[PDB]
Design a protein around this ligand. Structure first.
Ligand SMILES: [Zn+2]
Lengths: 55, 88, 148, 101, 62, 257
């Protein structure tokens, strides 16, 4: 770095689909019918009901 | 940033501010200059920062809540001593 | 008698609102990090914000989720709804920064500053907010299940 | 680590040495070896005899705190109190053994 | 010559008790293989695979 | 052309077909071999989870297999799970064969002898009719707090046909780690093979002393010297097992009375 960066240089950082996809993305979720807790798909609890039949 | 194909103004109080934080206006002779004109209403109500609960994690109450947050990898040392001899 | 009329009016002009402002301080995280993980939450139902937080393994989402269970715990006292409540402004506030000695190699020192922030959070109330039903696997309900 | 979240816990303490439960003093009675001595064999020699050793600071016990009383290094770690009879009897030379006049 | 007798005495009996722990662990382990030996006959678990002994009697691999 | 387009040796990638070509080099592209130290991202190799050395990785393959057999569930993390489930389908491929070649080829591999005494008894009874995929790799949801490594819950398949883990519950870990696991109340009337549950308390016997209650007190000083956040001081770490917790169990051995 032979120069300091004005914000418009620091701001380009936030446009590529690398910043956006890493930080600024909401996860798709739903309520685990057994635990009533929010949950992503493909993931389950450490619990017999959640483990035999994948909620 | 954010922007859902919608021109929400921007990132709010975030991207620009974190560039040059404003120097703190010091008191001369401990005086506050316009003290003798502005009302005495608590500053929580003057500019508008009116908060129902100012929960303070710098407290011995919430020491459990702080230790709930920090990452296990965030090792803190000198728990049971200090490098500088405290008895001097 | 004039500033006692303000401090009663400005107070009565602020609590009668459908808002609830709540500041958590010394959220042990810098502003660069903690704050960019807020702008995903700015403008979300609290039932969603309390969800998108509990999932992500980040620290910023676990700090705010510590509020969205305390703030609404206090919001429900103000009369504010438990359900229709929104996140109006969730902003990071630069806060206390310790100075720790660091000892670089070859007799050079460079002061690491253990950073800490403040978290300003304004739960507001959206009157007509329809809390969307979240009980169907995100979209396994289709394009994975055969047509009919 | 059957944890699902490692920590200062759920680190399976001895995933070997399954032959636990040694009754030292009971076994020391079979060998006729001064029960107080035998148990000292099985802890770092710092802890029993008058030897140069390295102690952890929490082990040292803190002053009387507002939260907790003065927790001396002994009343929390009884079996680590040095036994200076057992030291002297074994490690130091008594005036007696060299008394010549 | 007192701290020589001291050292040779802390080793001489670190085995004398190591000659009980492992000495008695074996003595106990053979209780285990006996109580396992007794239990594995009434419950009939031959502990030699999914097959019957007719795969053993050949004394091949199978 | 006449020689292979890419000569004798070149590493294609993860996610690449075999593209068989005339070559001198030897590639398995098949992994039916049981209890094998072939860790890699190829086809004939099971996934090489990270470790300091192919030796120390093998040492992690030991204490994670001997702890799946010991207790039929191990909450293993990351690329160890796809690397473990293939070692649970091998142990049964070792426990089914039965010949004294195999029972050693597992004796060489398990840190403890009682395991190779167990694995050959329950598994021929258990999996007499299952012929593959003996380990169920169900992923837990909350990625580790110490790093974003995922946590799968590899458990052996049917336990209702077992003899040691008949009706146990694994919804939560044992309270003190030397305490036997909670049992499904619908089958509370189950007793165990004695050699399994008499050697366990032989092991669990060392934590019921006070010398371990000193090593427990002490360890909490280490984790503070090494400063680990949220470690209670060794002054308020009152023992795991105690005399009040003694009276139940000696009177829970009413069988030998
Ligand atoms: Zn669940």
């Amino acid at each position: 770095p032979k120069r300091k960066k004005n914000p418009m240089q620091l701001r380009r950082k936030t446009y590529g689909l690398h910043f956006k996809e890493r930080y600024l993305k909401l996860e798709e979720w739903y309520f685990c019918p057994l635990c009533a807790e929010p949950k992503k798909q493909g993931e389950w609890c450490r619990r017999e009901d959640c483990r035999q039949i994948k909620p | 940033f954010t922007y859902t194909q919608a021109q929400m103004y921007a990132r709010y109080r975030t991207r620009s501010r974190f560039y040059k934080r404003p120097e703190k206006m010091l008191k001369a002779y401990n005086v506050s200059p316009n003290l003798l004109r502005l009302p005495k209403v608590k500053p929580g109500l003057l500019k508008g920062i009116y908060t129902d609960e100012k929960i303070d994690l710098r407290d011995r109450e919430r020491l459990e809540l702080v230790e709930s947050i920090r990452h296990p990898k965030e090792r803190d040392f000198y728990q049971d001593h200090t490098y500088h001899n405290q008895w001097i | 008698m004039y500033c006692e009329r303000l401090e009663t009016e400005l107070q009565k002009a602020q609590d009668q609102l459908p808002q609830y402002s709540f500041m958590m301080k010394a959220v042990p995280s810098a502003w660069k990090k903690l704050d960019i993980e807020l702008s995903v939450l700015r403008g979300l139902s609290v039932r969603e914000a309390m969800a998108q937080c509990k999932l992500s393994p980040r620290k910023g989402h676990m700090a705010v989720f510590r509020a969205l269970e305390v703030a609404q715990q206090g919001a429900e006292g103000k009369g504010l709804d438990k359900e229709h409540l929104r996140i109006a402004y969730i902003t990071c506030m630069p806060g206390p920064t310790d100075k720790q000695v660091d000892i670089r190699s070859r007799g050079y020192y460079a002061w690491k500053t253990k950073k800490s922030s403040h978290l300003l959070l304004t739960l507001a109330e959206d009157p007509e907010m329809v809390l969307p039903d979240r009980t169907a696997i995100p979209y396994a309900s289709l394009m994975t299940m055969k047509r009919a | 680590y059957n944890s699902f979240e490692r920590g200062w816990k759920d680190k399976t303490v001895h995933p070997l040495d399954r032959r636990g439960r040694f009754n030292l003093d009971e076994a020391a009675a079979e060998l006729q070896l001064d029960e107080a001595y035998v148990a000292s064999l099985y802890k770092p020699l710092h802890y029993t005899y008058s030897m140069k050793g390295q102690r952890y600071p929490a082990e040292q016990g803190r002053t009387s705190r507002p939260g907790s009383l003065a927790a001396s290094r002994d009343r929390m770690f009884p079996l680590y109190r040095r036994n200076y009879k057992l030291n002297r009897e074994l490690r130091v030379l008594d005036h007696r053994r060299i008394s010549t006049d | 010559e007192k701290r020589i007798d001291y050292a040779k005495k802390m080793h001489r009996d670190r085995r004398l008790v190591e000659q009980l722990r492992t000495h008695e662990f074996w003595g106990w382990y053979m209780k285990l293989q006996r109580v396992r030996g007794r239990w594995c006959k009434e419950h009939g678990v031959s502990s030699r695979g999914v097959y019957g002994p007719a795969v053993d009697a050949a004394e091949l691999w199978g | 052309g006449r020689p292979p387009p890419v000569m004798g040796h070149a590493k294609r990638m993860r996610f690449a077909g075999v593209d068989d070509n005339p070559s001198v080099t030897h590639k398995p592209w098949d992994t039916s071999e049981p209890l094998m130290a072939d860790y890699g991202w190829e086809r004939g190799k099971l996934p090489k989870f990270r470790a300091r050395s192919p030796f120390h990785r093998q040492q992690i393959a030991r204490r994670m297999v001997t702890e799946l057999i010991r207790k039929d569930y191990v909450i293993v993390g990351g690329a160890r799970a796809p690397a473990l489930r293939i070692l649970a389908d091998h142990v049964v491929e070792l426990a089914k064969a039965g010949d004294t070649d195999s029972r050693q080829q597992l004796a060489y591999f398990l840190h403890d002898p009682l395991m190779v005494d167990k694995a050959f008894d329950e598994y021929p009874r258990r999996f007499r009719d299952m012929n593959a995929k003996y380990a169920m790799m169900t992923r837990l949801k909350g990625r580790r707090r110490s790093d974003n490594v995922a946590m799968y819950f590899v458990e052996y398949k049917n336990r209702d046909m077992s003899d040691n883990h008949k009706g146990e519950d694994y919804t939560a870990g044992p309270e003190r780690f030397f305490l036997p696991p909670r049992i499904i109340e619908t089958e509370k009337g189950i007793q165990r093979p004695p050699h399994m549950q008499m050697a366990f308390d032989r092991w669990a016997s060392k934590f019921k002393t006070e010398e371990f209650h000193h090593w427990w007190r002490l360890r909490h000083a280490k984790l503070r010297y090494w400063g680990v956040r949220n470690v209670p001081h060794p002054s308020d770490v009152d023992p795991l097992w105690t005399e009040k917790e003694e009276e139940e169990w000696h009177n829970e051995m009413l069988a030998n009375t």
